[model samples]
Target chain A: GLSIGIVGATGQVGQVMRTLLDERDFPASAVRFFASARSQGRKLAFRGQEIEVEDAETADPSGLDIALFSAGSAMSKVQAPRFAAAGVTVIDNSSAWRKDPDVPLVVSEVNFERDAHRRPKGIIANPNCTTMAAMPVLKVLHDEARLVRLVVSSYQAVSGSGLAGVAELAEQARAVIGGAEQLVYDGGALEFPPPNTYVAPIAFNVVPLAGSLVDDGSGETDEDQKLRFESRKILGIPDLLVSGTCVRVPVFTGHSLSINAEFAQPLSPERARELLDGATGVQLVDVPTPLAAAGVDESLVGRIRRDPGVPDGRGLALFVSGDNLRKGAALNTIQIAELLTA
Target chain B: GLSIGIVGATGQVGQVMRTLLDERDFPASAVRFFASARSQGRKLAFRGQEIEVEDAETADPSGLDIALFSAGSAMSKVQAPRFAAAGVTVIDNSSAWRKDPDVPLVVSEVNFERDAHRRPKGIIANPNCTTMAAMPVLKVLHDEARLVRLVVSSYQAVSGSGLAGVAELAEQARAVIGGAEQLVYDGGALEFPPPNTYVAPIAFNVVPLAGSLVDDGSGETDEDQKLRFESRKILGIPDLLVSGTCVRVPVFTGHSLSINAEFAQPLSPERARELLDGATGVQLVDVPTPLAAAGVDESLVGRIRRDPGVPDGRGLALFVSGDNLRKGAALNTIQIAELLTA
Candidate 1:
């Protein structure tokens, strides 16, 4: 039995992690939850037990075999290494250690090898939610036919922003919809509260700017850069041509991507569908929507068609949906922990 | 002043056309509204006067110089020809006449010249709402550097499905948000009625399948097929490699596209932006969301970034949003009517 610790247990992803540990029947003996000092005394349910959360900054990690970190990137930047240095392997859900060569950024099914070598820093970084959903689907296709270029447009849910994002979506949608007069006649006439998490009104609307714009002036947001960089890292294709536009939609949980992938070898839709049918952590459905994939663990992919725009059947277009919290963040981190023990 | 008849004037696009005709102040001497027999007696306000709707099936087009058709494709197939044969130039909003080699498909600014030769059928076709939004933006870039390939994923509004689609999104969203318990606890727990206009729920979720699946065994929807065929026709590039995945979002009025376009020659983002700045029917903004473009006439485009994946800076990725009813359907038709008089 392994002793485990959950940093940021009071947050959204952390809550999912707690549920997944029991749902997946993770072999753990002593379990601990950790959050900020503000939430230190809070009790969270896991396996019918209310585990009290400890202050992550002050808690000793020496007793834990593994610690999952879902705190903000800044906290991960400071605390993840501290936990790792204390001999507890850190599975970080933040972007803090992702780009560091000392840490391995991984998707459980796509690249598990990187997990075995959580070497210099004993830290494993989970890919961003947008990249996480795409990894399982793209991996199977990339294996059958060498993937070359990728053009991705994301339909990300507000939950990718965490509890605050979910709250904003709910509050704004309620405000707009509760105005039955305006909502019935003019959907856009109903005004929403100023957006708290996003830059624009995200209720019944799609905002193209997902993350803050990167200072590099390339017109790419931080989310877009993460998609490009993390996909390359997890797929082990450092030079893969990847361009992504991350947009936030009103969906609460699942994140979807509309991907146009060009392959070096010809891969027809039929063959691609056959390949993805039993691919690890991937589900082939007729139409993959966020609602269907909300609580599911696997990435649901469908609408697979040959991109006639690219010659020789080298291009394939697909729509992928996955539970942003389950597969995108918590489950993948837990799977990495499983990989470590295996 | 011109005698103008609006066929299917009770439909969604027809209603928008009626307003746009007055809003744009098109030179209309006499305006006649026509719909199905059910709505024949309905009076609609246009130009401070009530215009009685006539049965489109039995409308007299003899005295009308132009007739805008927003009827279904079958209606357009049957009535547009009769209106055209009656010496009334038909600007059709349906897909019925789009594939007719004699009926030139026109986007107002993209190819107004195509409207110049409506000789054979005396009918001009408007592109699909999805294609309509992209054409103006793509046209400017395509002119700068000849476009060779386009990979498009659309965030189309329910308004593209007409009033029912709008109602579905509003009703479903209201129902889901109105469920306080489910919304607060489980975003996925809320149930929606069986979708009337879409294959899946279009509220709080994005449906990748926009239109009915095409029977051609290509795994493409009718909307996808329309996008490819219509874009080629309107852009005057008979062999352009275009692949589109049309998705229906929760939006009520606007249609958006995430487009990755590859051109024959090098075109940087700066050059693309400069060209699009002065282009007709295109509004270059910092971030283009469906909400901002809902009622606007011009297609809103931004997030222009160079695709390093395509060699020699020939590839560019962009986000475009436009009012599906106004510019995508009725306004483009009205613009073509204006083109006829000019």
Candidate 2:
């Protein structure tokens, strides 16, 4: 049996990973917790032991077999390789190595079998939640008639940006509803309290651009580029004309998308439904939205069928919802670990 | 001064027509009210005078110079001929004669000049509210680029279907909020009230079809076909490939559209904005949707840019909102009468 270690263990996602590891009934010889320098001495309940967290930069991982990382991307970039060099496999929840050529992006249900050949590279990447929300469905359709183009609008939840993003919405909304001055949070401006994560005052309004403006004049944001590139690589639709508008809505956990996709060969409503209803890791829901997606394991798909506005029945418009913080990040890393052990 | 008569003067839209008549300060010598037997004896205030309501079939229009009709299309078909034969020019707010070659479909901001040259054979028909919302804006742009196609999805208000539609939504929402058995009005196999007005319960949800299906299978609904036909005649775009989905949402009065229009030539965002900013009756907004569209005179245009998802910048996406009762129905009829006298 292998001893497991969790880095950034005091964060919202780290806490979920602990629950999922227990729920999945993975064999654990011992468990250790690691957090930031401030939380280093704090004790966390894991398995049947109270494990004291240590500062990740100075900690030794010689005896630890697997370390799951959920700290910020910058921290992950600095620390993940150190643990990997010390003979521990690191499953990262951050985007630190996602676009790197060495990392194989894994979603256990979609690409678990590719693991045996993939892990020879040692480091694995987890795709972003918005991209992850779309993969299971897109993979099934791409297998049928190759995907040619993707135009999607995301109604992403605050949680995809982690717990700080959630706190920002609540604080801003409380201020707005209480008739206080709207405080704008410029992403680079300063270190503020409570509502420090997002760059806008997001109460009762939809913000179209997220992350930051990209370098090119493509007029697309950083989030849109990530979704397009990651989706192309993950689903293997390199030639796909992917145009997206990422909208940050005031939802807590579930992220949703309104997708309009055109395929190479004609895919009718009947045929699309047949494929989706039989696909794994996806739930054919009656009505799928961010609100309905909360607490659900599988990605919920609804508003399905042919998009009549586009050419023939080749165009499809539908909505999808998923637990962005869980399956989109931490749970996926643990699930990948479960597959590796098997 | 001309004598003006209002039929269907007891309904919700008729009341609005009366209020607008007073607000516009119509130069009227006399005003009379007409209704069905149910509201026959009642009196309604028009132009500061209590006007006695008469039955539509028996109402005398000999001295009436113009009759503003708001009765349903069925009532207009039967009653408008009498008013027309009475030598009273009928400006009808129904669809009975809109598509007829004899009647001119008018939107003052779009084609008020049409009122100067051609008088309808008897009745001048007002276009549907959905068409009224887009035609004004499209006419301005079409004048610039000559529109070739229109694809629209409407977030329409319940009031378009009249007062019963409003009552149904309020009742159903109360039921859903209070945990009542009948979540839908006359739902399931409960043998409840017939769906004479709307196809489904108009509560918190949105229903895709607004009116009864039309005979044509060219992908346009009855409302959609009306919009296309009326738009072609009004804007003079005969070969346009117009398709629409008219959805009824739980809003009170405003109607919004998510539109993608193709033009003969490329229309840049800068140029589109310049033309739209001072266009006859459109207001340029950031991102106009149904929520912000209520109680405004100008149709709001937002998200104005090159639609890359389509073939070229020949395509654009926009939203439009105006008071359904005002520009959509009552106000337009009154505005047309104002145009005729001038």
Candidate 3:
């Protein structure tokens, strides 16, 4: 049995991680919770017992076998190494350690075994939610026929920005959905309050810019860049040609991607479907929607078709959706710890 | 001054077309309205007079100079030729005549001059609303460097499905939004009512299958095929390689497309912006959203960048939003009629 510690225990992802730990039959001998100074000494009930929360900076992580870090990049940068130095394995859920060569980025079903043990920083990095949904699905196809190029457009949820995102959507939905007749005539019928989390109103509207634009002359957002960089690292495709457009939708939890992938060898839609039917962390269906993928563990995949542009049957296009908080962040981290336990 | 007839005048697009004609400086000596038998007896208030609706199937076509058909394809298939045979020029807003060899498909801003006067059947075809938004934006780019390949992913609105779509979205929103706290934890927290218009819940969800799937070995929906077929026809690029993934979001009016276009010659984002800034039917902005483009006549374009996947600096990626009803359907029909007047 492993002693587990969860940092940022009160945030949205942290709350989801705690609930998931209770539902899954995890072999946890002891559990500890850590948050900021505000949530320190708070009581969070676990397994019929109340556990007092500890401050991540001041807590002693020496006895814990695996510490899951859902804290933002700032806290993960300061505390992840400190906990690893105390002999605790840190599974981070932020962008801080993902690009680090020493800390292997792991999508459990794809490259966890090949890359998990070589983590010099004793940390494994989960992917961005948008790219996370595509890794397992793409891995199986790439193995059958080498993947060469990718063009992805994402419909991401508001919850990717955390609790504040949920609040923004809920508030705007109430303010605008009142006069359906008025809005039906003119889409911008009512003035939306200045956005708090996203660049535009997130109610009944899709915002194409998901994150801040990076200044590196590529004109790609940080979120869009993360999809390109993270997928290459996790798939071990050093020079995989990738282009992504990340957009924020009115969804609450799951993130989806519409992908067009070109492969080196021939791949038919029939052959692609057969491969993905039993692929790990993937559920094959007729259509994949975020509402259906919200609480599920596997990424829902469907609408598979042959790309007519890539001649000789070398390309396939599909849609994928997965819970951004579950397999995207918390569950993958726990799955890594379980594999380490064995 | 010319006599004008609006078929399916009681439908959504017909309503918008009537509104646009009244607002614009259209020279109309006589205005006539036509709809199904269900609406034939009703009177529609238009420009200080109440016009009694006539049956599109049985209405007299000899007096009108131009008849705009907004009825479904079934009605337009039977009536457009009859009206055109009566020596009245017919402008169709449906897919019935767009593919015919004799009927010219027009996007008012591009190819309208070259194609409008060449209609052998005295009938003109308006492009699909989804494809209509991209023509003005893609035409300028295609003229610059000669377009070769296109990979498009769409974020379409419910209003494209018409009034029932608006009702479904409104109903699902009311049912599910009551428990925002419950939904904050689980996205599918409450059971959504079975969707009436779409395949799934359209309140806070995105459905990938926009139109019905065709069983022609392509595994694509009709709406997806329209994008490829319409773009090729409107842009006069018959051999153009095109792939599209169409999706329906929860927006009320505007349709957006994230396009990655590869050109034969080198095209830079800086140069592309200069061409689109003063381009007709296009408004260049920093970030284009459906809300801002909902009531506007122009297609809003932004997020112009180089697609890293396409080699030799030949590809550009951009986001476009246009009111699916305005420039997409009704306004373009009015523009085509105005050009004929000139």
Candidate 4:
């Protein structure tokens, strides 16, 4: 029996971890909760047992076997090493260690065995929800042809931003209902009210670009960088040209992508479908959307067709959607921990 | 007073043209009506007089001044020249002559000189309802920097496809209400019932690609090629790299585009807005959509902001909506005819 600690146990992904741990039969001697100071002392159900959350900084993981952290990168940056030094296997669901040279990035379904030793070199990084879900489906076909370029545009959901994101959307919904002069929460906005977390009102609209501008002023987001860096590490392609645009839409859960992929050898729809039919952790839907992807485990892929403009008809385009909080963050991390124990 | 003719007088665009001429102060003494054999005997009002639509193939246009052609390319191809050769200038709304080298492409705001020649030597080609409207708004800013590339995606209305496109969408709406599978009338699709015009359901949904594929199996359609060609011709930039994805949305009239345009030099938002402030045939809307653009003579451009990704911050992104039946087709032709007569 092993002791487990779940950091950010009060956050969205953290709560999902709590639910998965409760519903699934895990060989656990003791499960402890850890979150921010505000969430400490909050009681949550873990496998039908009441677990009181402790403050992240003060939580002592002296005998903890595994601690899953989902408190975002900043908290992970400060607490990941501390948990690791305590002989606790830290499964990070943040961008902090995913690109770090020392950490082993795992997707369980793909490239999980690269570093599976006990202690597993201390920290294991989980890929972004959108990346983890998309790469598995795309990688299944990449084996047939060398995937050269990826131009991905994502329609992310409100839930991806956590409770604050959800609250902002709800607030915007109220504001729009009041018929106020168009609230421009996102910058470059016209007369719209100021924004909080989201750049604009996402209640019944779409934001073309997400996250703040990067070095290019091109408005490349932190989410874009994560999708790029985490995808590169998980797929073992460091130089792969991944150009991504993250867009926030009104959907409450599940993240979807419109992917234009260029491959070395031309891959037809039939061939791509045949490969994806049996791919692990992937489902082939005829027409997939964020609404359908909600509450689902397997990443749904649809609109599978060719990208003809590419030279030699060697490109493929498709749509993908998956529950970001689940398979994207919580479930994958749990799967990694289960794999390590197994 | 000059004699004029209305081609495809019973169609949607034709109806708009007929209505505009009847109500407006356009200089026309006698209005000639022409339609396909099926609609030859239909009587429509023009300038408070009922004019019978004659068979376009057999119409005597010797006394007509300018014939406004809204009949699809099939009818326009056979009859526009007959009218033009009969000393009647033809203002065509079809795509048939729009890309022809002999014809002059005119967007009243940018290339008004193209309409100066009194005689319609070949045919005065009108742009697509979607592209026709976006041109006026875009051309105003091109002076700051030559438009180098266009990545425009549309939210097209059903009326662009004429009666059949509308019928298809309406039937789909009724089918959805009845909880029945939408019958695809084209017969080519296997998953859905055959539909004559649209490939799939257009009610409360979005279809990615528009127009049929080119002969080379490249998904680029005839309409897609026309936009690129017309944009280059009207803007006088032969080498402009214009790539557009035409999407069909649920709206009934007016076509909207989410355009990301690049230029040769940097253009700030303030400068672009100032340029647009005086642009003709364009009304800047805060939130322009097809519903608002319907029956309007103006192209509504809004969501005006810079595409930070453009080199030196020169690129601009916007959403423009234009009445597909009005300025896109019938109105633009009439406007050209008015300017020529003046």
Q: Report the number of the highest-lDDT candidate.
A: 3
Error of 3 at A207 (Å): 0.3
Q: Assess each prediction's global lDDT (C-alpha) against the native.
A: 0.86, 0.70, 0.90, 0.71
Off by over 4 Å in 2: A1-125, A128-131, A153-220, A223-227, A246-257, A285-292, A300-313, A317-342, B2-106, B111-132, B149-239, B242-255, B289-291, B311-313, B317-334
Q: Locate the minimum summed-lDDT window of 10 residues in model 3 chain B.
A: B179-188
lDDT digits (tens) for residues B35-88 of candidate 4 = 778878978766567888898898688888778888788877878888878887
In model 3, what is the error at residue B271, expressed in angstroms?
A: 1.2
Expressed as tens digits, the lDDT of each residue in B154-273 for candidate 1 is 888787877788778877876666663243224468778778888888887888997778898899998898888988898999998988998888877788899999999999889988
Instruction: Identify the candidate with maximal TM-score.
Output: 3
Mind giving the per-residue lDDT tens digits that candidate 1 earns over A56-80? 8888889899999999889998898
- Per-residue lDDT for B1-342 in model 2, tens only? 989988888876787789888888998888888998878998876655788998988877898899999888899998899888889888888989887877888887777786524764678888898889887788888999979866665667777878877566545543443222221111231222333465654442344556665664333358856766787888876656665656565555667665667788998767888898998668887655433444455777765545565666777755565667777888888888898887
TM-score of 4: 0.68
- List model 3 lDDT by residue over A239-336, tens digit each: 99898999999988889999999999999999999999989899999989988888889999999998888999998889998889888888888888
Instruction: Give the clashing pairs for model 2.
Output: none
- Per-residue lDDT of model 3, residues B47-151, tens digit only: 999999999898789989999989989998899989998898999999998889888999998988878999888899988999999999999999999999999
* TM-score versus the correct structure, for each prediction: 0.97, 0.73, 0.99, 0.68
- Among all windows of ten consecutive residues in candidate 1 chain B, which has the lowest summed lDDT? B179-188
Rank all candidate structures by their DockQ, best first, as comma-separated numbers.
3, 1, 4, 2
Q: After superposition, how far is residue A115 of candidate 1 from its true place, in Å?
A: 4.7
